[PDB]
Every structure is written in structure tokens, then in C-alpha cells.
């Protein structure tokens, strides 16, 4: 998860990691991913198992 | 062994109910405890509210939560509350609690001054006070 | 925690571990206790 989108020692190799056919995430992307776990459907799924 | 003079019992209607009613007896009487508890357990297990809590604390609002396997079973009981009319020979069904569906996470009872004087709670509350 | 291998693990790391595990268990335990205390059996809190 690429930080504040500035020059990090982790961000500078992100484009490189993606050349492997692999996905790094903006914080907004990862927040969307996580907020996707509070949808009624997966809230109910958590209650089962 | 001598009969009491000829006795008639008369049971009071709505309008008389008061917060904390019957609760002095609930402390001191085994017989009364068993009545109130049988009833409280019935309401908690099937509709997710305590008739005792309502009599004791007379809350303004009370919200029932349908979370988890215990909460869905309670929600069914709220949905399965129907009107059994028989029109044209065949049976027809009508939902008390129009708001409560397969997607409802909660339902809220409201009242201006306290749920103990909303008739759906008043009636059982008064009934128990008397039966106890 | 950066530049802290096995042999460097000391006060910061033991504290970090308290934040990021032991006190999350504690936090969950507290809201468990508070719900149960009020007989709240049908409003689970989802822990992400």
C-alpha cells in the first residue's frame, strides 16, 4: 500500500513489483477494499463463520 | 374449615398501569417471580425484549437487533406475525411489522413519554401484574 | 519497528507487540464484557 503517494523507499520499487503481474494499492483503493467488508452481505457472512 | 363470605374478583383494565408496578411482590413472592420470569423469558427468547425491563425502567425508545443466528430467529418471529383472514373460501396473509424484511438489522419501538403506555407492552405488563 | 532483528528485540518491540496484539485482545474482551453485562446477544461488533 504505497503511502501518501510521495517518494518512499517502498514506493520507488512498486512500479517494479507490478512488472511481475502483481498489484500494489493506493490508500483509497485499500480503504475501498476494507469498507467493502462492512457491506451488509459480508457483515452477515462474518456472523455465520 | 369455614368458607369466606361470597367473593367476586374484578381485574383492572388499561389506564391504571404505573412504572415499577408489581415489582415489590416480585422481590418477596416465589409465585410472582415464576409468573414474571416465565413471561420475561418468553419475550426475550421470541421477540428480543424484556417485559420486566419495560415495567422497571419504562424506556422512551427500545430497539431490537437481528444480529447473528439468535437475531434472525427473532426476526422470523416478528415477520411470522400475520393477520389470518379467510376471503372467498381461501386464506390470505398480512404483515404486522411492514418495515421488518430479510434485510432488516433492527426494529425500534417509539413512544413520546415511555413504552409502558404503548398498548402492545401495557397489556402484557398489566396482565402479569394481576396474574402474579 | 525497522532495523530490529531477533537480537535487537527489546523495549520498543515488546511495547509495539502490546499495542498490536495483547491490547487488541484486551479491547475485544472489554466490548465482549460490556455487551454481555447488558445481555446484548444479537448485536455483534465486526472486528476488521
Curated annotation (Swiss-Prot), chain A:
Post-translational modifications reported in the UniProt record: 4'-phosphopantetheine is transferred from CoA to a specific serine of the Acyl carrier domain by the C-terminal PPT domain. This modification is essential for activity because fatty acids are bound in thioester linkage to the sulfhydryl of the prosthetic group.
Top-rank taxon: Eukaryota
Subunit structure: [Alpha(6)beta(6)] hexamers of two multifunctional subunits (alpha and beta).
Protein family: Belongs to the thiolase-like superfamily. Fungal fatty acid synthetase subunit alpha family.
Note: Present with 17000 molecules/cell in log phase SD medium.
Entry function: Fatty acid synthetase catalyzes the formation of long-chain fatty acids from acetyl-CoA, malonyl-CoA and NADPH. The alpha subunit contains domains for: acyl carrier protein, 3-oxoacyl-[acyl-carrier-protein] reductase, and 3-oxoacyl-[acyl-carrier-protein] synthase. This subunit coordinates the binding of the six beta subunits to the enzyme complex.
Name recorded for this polypeptide: Fatty acid synthase subunit alpha
Coverage span on the entire protein: 872 to 920 of 1887
UniProtKB/Swiss-Prot annotation, chain B:
Highest taxon of source: Eukaryota
Gene this protein is translated from: FAS1
Stretches the record annotates as Malonyl/palmitoyl transferase: 1-132
Shown segment, full-protein numbering: 1656 to 1787 of 2051
Similarity comment: family membership: Belongs to the fungal fatty acid synthetase subunit beta family.
Functional note: Fatty acid synthetase catalyzes the formation of long-chain fatty acids from acetyl-CoA, malonyl-CoA and NADPH. The beta subunit contains domains for: [acyl-carrier-protein] acetyltransferase and malonyltransferase, S-acyl fatty acid synthase thioesterase, enoyl-[acyl-carrier-protein] reductase, and 3-hydroxypalmitoyl-[acyl-carrier-protein] dehydratase.
Protein name: Fatty acid synthase subunit beta
Subunit structure: [Alpha(6)beta(6)] hexamers of two multifunctional subunits (alpha and beta).
Remaining remarks: Present with 91800 molecules/cell in log phase SD medium.
